[PDB]
Symmetry: D2
Subunit: 148 residues, 4 copies
């Protein structure tokens, strides 16, 4: 009678407490697993981002490398031409300073001087390789500059 | 006489203009090559950074993966135990609700109820795996709960 | 008559040569611009990849940091409990070695010994925090171990 | 007597079992904390790598962008000049095809034709901007080409 009433009351209390404990345990398990899985998905996204960036960076590395090598090649070439030009120009100027008589054709000298001025003033803002072609003419004029 | 004086003046002008053009061309070549080389060194640093990050990310990916798998394993296990417990608890409570006479030992019932309360209240902030061991006792008490 | 025929022939030749030069110049301009634009799109993709990875890495950094701090906290705590336990255990063993008469309750001693064995053998593969709760019982048993 | 001998034996067993359990717990705590700390150091290295790469990538992005804009500018300019040239060339060729009498100076026509050939054959491997200067001469020659 009253023993059964107490049994029912206690069974009810245990039912409620057990379902509370059950929901609590399940929620905490789900939450910690969610934290782990979310950190894992973020690490995976970061690794895939690194892989994509590494591919694009092999690409950009090849581009920047061949560009730098191209510029180095053309720069060394035009520096070599510049040094040959400077050598012969110094030679001729020394010949003028040494000899007391005429050494060079004044027409060719004035033309070469004005050409040098034009070239130097085109070099103020465009690239330096747009000048390489003119370095031929200079050479030519330095070769026909002396009286001969 | 004056022809030689004019030759010297023009040679001087050409010397100065040529060295100006020379320094200008060399400076612009050096500057553009410096831009190319600096962009190349930065691209190389970026590629090496991507490689280092990719290695560290393989590492962190393995760590986060085995952690998530560990949590998933233990969570499924404790969920299975929870479902067995809930099954037998529902069975016993239904037996109480169905029969008009006593069904369970009230001492064991009160002990199991208070244990469930203790467990649910330990689960409020520590992990969920620290509870797995207690799930044994619950099971034991659910097996000796009915009058038999 | 023949002057006009030659004019037509030369105009035709110039038309063809001009369209050839035109297509050549346009193709080379388009190709170099394509190289520049493709390297630019790859650099942009790499930068965006780095940004996404940096965000995901702030996330993973926070996760790994709070996990390491949690483990350090609980490890220092359980190490402190272990050192208190070791202190009292050494104290009691020295009391046994020093006094020629009984010092401890043999029942409690055997129970504590078997509990230590159970605990050490559960620690062979699960975490170390699943043991923290048992460290209470040990303490309790070390406090009621001496004859008093 | 024998009670004390048994007490000593049991104290010895408990000492050894306790130090075994102690070393075991400490080793597992240290190992799991080491795993967490190592994953944390790797995540930190990866984040710092991403930051360095992002800086270098802002740099390379600026470089590649200004290069592409420079090429686009000069390409549109030389395309505009090419289209003006093609317009006047088509106009003159149509005048030749329409009128039954002479239309252009044959000397200028032959010179312009050979210049176009030289230019088209220089464009087989160097850049397309090294040609921009010659596009002036062409224009000039197309303006003095007709009999006037």
């Amino acid at each position: 009678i009253r023993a059964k009433s107490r049994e029912v009351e206690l069974t009810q209390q245990f039912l409620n407490e057990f379902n509370a404990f059950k929901a609590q345990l399940e929620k905490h398990s789900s939450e910690e697993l969610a934290s782990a899985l979310k950190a894992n998905e973020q690490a995976l996204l970061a690794k895939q981002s690194n892989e994509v960036a590494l591919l694009s960076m092999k690409q950009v590395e090849e581009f920047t490398k061949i560009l730098s090598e191209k510029l180095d090649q053309e720069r060394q070439g035009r520096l070599s031409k510049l040094e040959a030009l400077n050598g012969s120009v110094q030679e001729l100027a020394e010949a003028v300073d040494q000899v007391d008589t005429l050494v060079m054709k004044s027409e060719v000298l004035s033309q070469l001087s004005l050409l040098t001025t034009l070239l130097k003033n085109k070099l103020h803002a465009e690239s330096s390789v747009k000048i390489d072609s003119e370095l031929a003419r200079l050479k030519t004029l330095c070769d026909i500059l002396p009286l001969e």
